[PDB]
């Protein structure tokens, strides 16, 4: 029964391993193994549940084990395994073949098979851990082994993509351990993890690997959010080492998502407004990306309300995610109408929900934005309005209070008006008629730059796949 | 069936005129009982779910209607099924003999024509849609496929389907050659004009329901007085004052309806007050029309105040071009408008850039800004220009 179960799943794993083995042996092609590894994550997730854990036991028996002798026993010890007589030395798939990792040349140590085996061995370990959700000692045991192994290898062009996806599981397993249970050992454990990120990033800077650095930057910027250091994030993004060429679309959306939250504390939303919009256009619409589209839209509504301008109202109802976007609608309504008591009761009921996404602090600063937006609304209605006429609307305190809040709104060039105290009314200095100025000419220059930007990229993207069809023989 | 679904939704929300609640409650228990439709008496409970002023009395005693029981029971259900099961036995008996004979394409198509109307009158929706698939292969000429469009339109008016019904409406009307056929173009001025009310069009609907021929009588579906009522709805948006005095006021089609039924107060009272630009007589005709026209109709009350906001900004724009500077107290005593309610009316438009107006509260005067400027026209091209470049960049990177 259990004998035929191990031969079926292992043959499918070797069949996929032999495909990428001959691709890296001929010259240098870095895109051939990458296409299979994308589907390998989905195929292995469903395959690990079937036939239990016995598919990876004989895989260690097949290939020679440099480090893996005691790693499979410690993984099966936590589950209190039963002895099926799976002891190595029974199932042999090698049988002295060149593609089978011939044993005699391997045992004599005249050839090195460890490069394409041991590096691939760590990949299958992290896949089974994410399915069973194992924590505590099993997380630290794997992280301690991989770090010296990566420093011993030279990290060739094809070797940089093997561990590129392993860093995502290292950071994920460490964060889920701290949120589940907090202790004093978890704090000092992250200290070593912060040093390991910078040591490997410096090595990958020489190879200029596009996918490797794309995964690191996403994990490094996210670690600064929990650590709470802006100087580490500000100096990191100043180098601009992130390639835009071969990185995946899912990795691009995560990059622009961090720049929106970093620039949000600098009180400059001009650049941050583009990063949050570009992150949505680069994020897939599938179900696996719904978690990112949910968090990205929550930040988009908060950026516009902090700019003094009301965002698009139809964005809530047209989308199907508005169930979680309902609290943000009451925030926009309270700022636009200008009611002081409505804003206090708005954030009170949802105060518990605003703590998870850490957007409650941005909601506290909306208290002043209620008046900032209310002044712009009443200014467009009345070009010349008296001093006591505004207090009768928003129910402000005194007449001197409303007079000094308008002078602050013109600091950034929002209202663009003047206050005449001798006459007793506030007059708007904006006559429009900007068609006679040079201001629209500056915006029109960027539209030509944006049009010709995609023209050069059009020749690069379309012509590249036609290179292989010329050399290949056709009928 | 008659009117499809109207009287069923008359009891949904009624602000005034409680006497209409009794008439609407007696009509829903009359036609449905007289017709052969079994299930449409059961849907009365599902239509009023989560609504104010429900006419269904089960767990909620707040019903204000005189007839509070719309609820489905087994007394009327058993009586309607006996008539439905008896006729389907006779229809399936005669048609089955024609299927085995297979003489001509007329008897094969006409057999499903009587069924397409029958399954709609016995309360079968999805079962009637399968009857069109068999009649499609048995179609003879282009006119045979037109009857399929009627079945899609008739069955689509119950739930107000704007997707499959609206798309298949223009497909049958086009096909290979459109032409001036009365079985297509005339139905294009009616069925398509109904779907424009649910999507809030008011532009293309004004080019059909307003300017058209003098009859368009669909009998069971719509009547002449019903279609003529919506002529003043979409006609006050796209059509300017030049077309209001021709295709609305002086149009002979609406002249006979004013002298017949004067209770509409839409094509007459609203058009004369708007043409004269007199706010004194324009105000009292807004509440009278909103109550007796917009609220009872199903394709109107869904808009209601949304359509009222468009009528008010129309008269404010006409008077804006009639003067430059005017005192607020002078206009208040002229057209009979209050000062307190004047600030709230102009506060829902000016900040939205709907109308450009300047008001000086020191002297209590209103000014007139520039209605059209060169920079104001280019600002609309910014969103339209960037809106196109967004699709070209987003969809261009998706396919690569």
């Amino acid at each position: 029964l259990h004998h035929s179960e191990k031969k079926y799943a292992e043959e499918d794993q070797v069949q996929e391993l032999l495909k990428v083995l001959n691709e890296i042996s001929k010259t240098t092609l870095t895109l051939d193994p990458r296409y299979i590894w994308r589907s390998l994550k989905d195929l292995s997730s469903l395959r690990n549940q079937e036939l239990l854990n016995a598919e990876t036991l004989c895989f260690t028996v097949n290939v020679l084990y440099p480090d893996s002798s005691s790693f499979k026993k410690n993984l099966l010890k936590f589950i209190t395994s039963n002895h099926k007589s799976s002891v190595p030395g029974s199932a042999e798939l090698r049988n002295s073949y060149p593609a089978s990792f011939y044993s005699v040349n391997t045992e004599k140590k005249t050839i090195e098979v460890t490069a394409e085996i041991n590096c691939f061995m760590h990949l299958l370990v992290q896949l089974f851990l994410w399915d069973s959700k194992e924590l505590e000692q099993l997380v630290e045991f794997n992280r301690k082994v991989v770090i010296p192994n990566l420093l011993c290898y030279y990290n060739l062009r094809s070797l940089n993509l093997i561990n590129a996806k392993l860093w995502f599981y290292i950071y994920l397993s460490h964060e889920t351990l701290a949120r589940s249970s907090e202790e004093i050992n978890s704090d000092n454990q992250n200290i070593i993890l912060r040093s390991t990120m910078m040591k490997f990033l410096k090595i990958a800077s020489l190879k200029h690997d596009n996918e490797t650095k794309a995964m690191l930057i996403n994990l490094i910027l996210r670690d600064f959010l929990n650590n709470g250091e802006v100087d580490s994030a500000s100096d990191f993004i100043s180098k601009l080492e992130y390639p835009h060429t071969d990185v995946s679309s899912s990795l691009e959306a995560r990059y622009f998502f961090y720049l929106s939250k970093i620039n949000a504390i600098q009180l400059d939303y001009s650049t941050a407004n583009e990063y949050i919009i570009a992150a949505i256009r680069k994020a897939p619409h599938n179900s696996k990306s719904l978690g990112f589209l949910q968090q990205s839209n929550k930040l988009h509504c908060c950026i516009q309300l902090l700019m003094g301008d009301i965002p698009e109202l139809s964005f809530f109802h047209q989308s199907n995610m508005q169930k979680s976007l309902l609290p943000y609608y009451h925030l926009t309504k309270a700022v636009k109408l200008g009611d002081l008591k409505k804003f206090t009761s708005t954030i009170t009921k949802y105060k518990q929900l605003l703590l998870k996404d850490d957007t409650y602090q941005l909601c506290v600063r909306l208290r002043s934005n209620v008046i900032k937006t209310g002044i712009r609304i009443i200014s467009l209605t009345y070009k010349k309005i008296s001093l006591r006429d505004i207090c009768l609307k928003l129910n402000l305190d005194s007449e001197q209070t409303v007079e000094y809040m308008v002078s602050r709104a013109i600091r950034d060039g929002v209202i663009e008006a003047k206050i005449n105290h001798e006459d007793g009314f506030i007059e708007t200095t904006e006559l429009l008629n900007i068609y006679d100025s040079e201001d629209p000419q500056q915006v029109f220059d960027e539209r030509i730059k944006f049009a010709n930007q995609l023209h050069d990229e059009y020749l690069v993207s379309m012509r590249y796949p036609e290179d292989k069809k010329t050399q290949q023989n056709e009928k | 069936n008659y009117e499809v679904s109207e009287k069923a939704f008359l009891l949904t929300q009624s602000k005034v005129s409680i006497e209409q609640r009794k008439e609407a409650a007696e009509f829903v228990l009359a036609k449905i009982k007289e017709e052969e439709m079994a299930p449409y008496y059961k849907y009365l409970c599902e239509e009023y779910l989560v609504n104010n002023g429900q006419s269904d009395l089960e767990h909620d005693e707040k019903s204000d209607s005189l007839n509070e029981w719309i609820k489905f029971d087994q007394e009327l259900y058993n009586e309607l099924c006996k008539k439905n099961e008896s006729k389907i036995k006779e229809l399936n008996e005669k048609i089955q003999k024609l299927e085995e004979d297979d003489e001509g394409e007329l008897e094969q198509a006409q057999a499903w024509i009587n069924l397409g109307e029958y399954y709609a009158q016995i309360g079968d929706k999805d079962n009637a849609e399968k009857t069109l698939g068999k009649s499609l292969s048995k179609a003879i000429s282009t006119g045979a496929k037109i009857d399929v469009m009627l079945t899609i339109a008739r069955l689509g008016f119950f739930y107000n389907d704007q997707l499959y019904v609206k798309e298949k409406l223009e497909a049958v009307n086009s096909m290979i050659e459109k032409g001036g056929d009365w079985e297509r173009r005339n139905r294009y001025k009616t069925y398509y004009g109904i779907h424009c009310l649910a999507v809030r069009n008011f532009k293309e609907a004004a080019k059909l329901l307003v300017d058209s021929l003098a009859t368009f009588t669909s009998i069971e579906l719509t009547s002449y007085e019903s279609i003529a009522t919506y002529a003043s709805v979409t006609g006050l948006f796209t059509l300017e004052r030049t077309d209001l005095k021709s295709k609305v006021i002086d149009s002979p089609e609406l002249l006979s309806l004013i002298s017949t039924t004067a209770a509409l107060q839409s094509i007459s009272s609203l058009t004369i007050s708007l043409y004269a630009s007199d706010y004194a007589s324009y105000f009292p005709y807004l509440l009278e029309t909103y109550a007796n026209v917009l609220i009872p109709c199903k394709y109107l009350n869904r808009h209601a105040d949304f359509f009222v906001r468009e009528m008010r900004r129309k008269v404010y724009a006409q008077l804006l071009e009639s003067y430059k500077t005017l005192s607020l107290k002078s206009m208040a005593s002229a057209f009979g408008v209050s000062v307190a309610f004047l600030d709230n009316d102009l506060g829902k438009f000016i900040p939205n850039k709907q109308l450009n107006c300047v008001i000086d509260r020191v002297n209590g005067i209103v000014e007139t800004n520039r209605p059209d400027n060169k920079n104001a026209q280019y600002h609309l091209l910014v969103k339209q220009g960037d809106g196109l470049l967004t699709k070209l960049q987003k969809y261009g990177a998706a396919v690569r």
Partner: peptide, 27 residues
């Protein structure tokens, strides 16, 4: 649905009939 169906209206209901009060009294 730009600036219309999202915020609805929620006005001009009981305040419209109240306008005729000041019209039939002060005049």
């Amino acid at each position: 649905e730009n600036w219309d169906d999202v915020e609805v209206d929620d006005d001009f209901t009981n305040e419209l009939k109240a306008e005729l009060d000041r019209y039939k009294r002060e005049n």
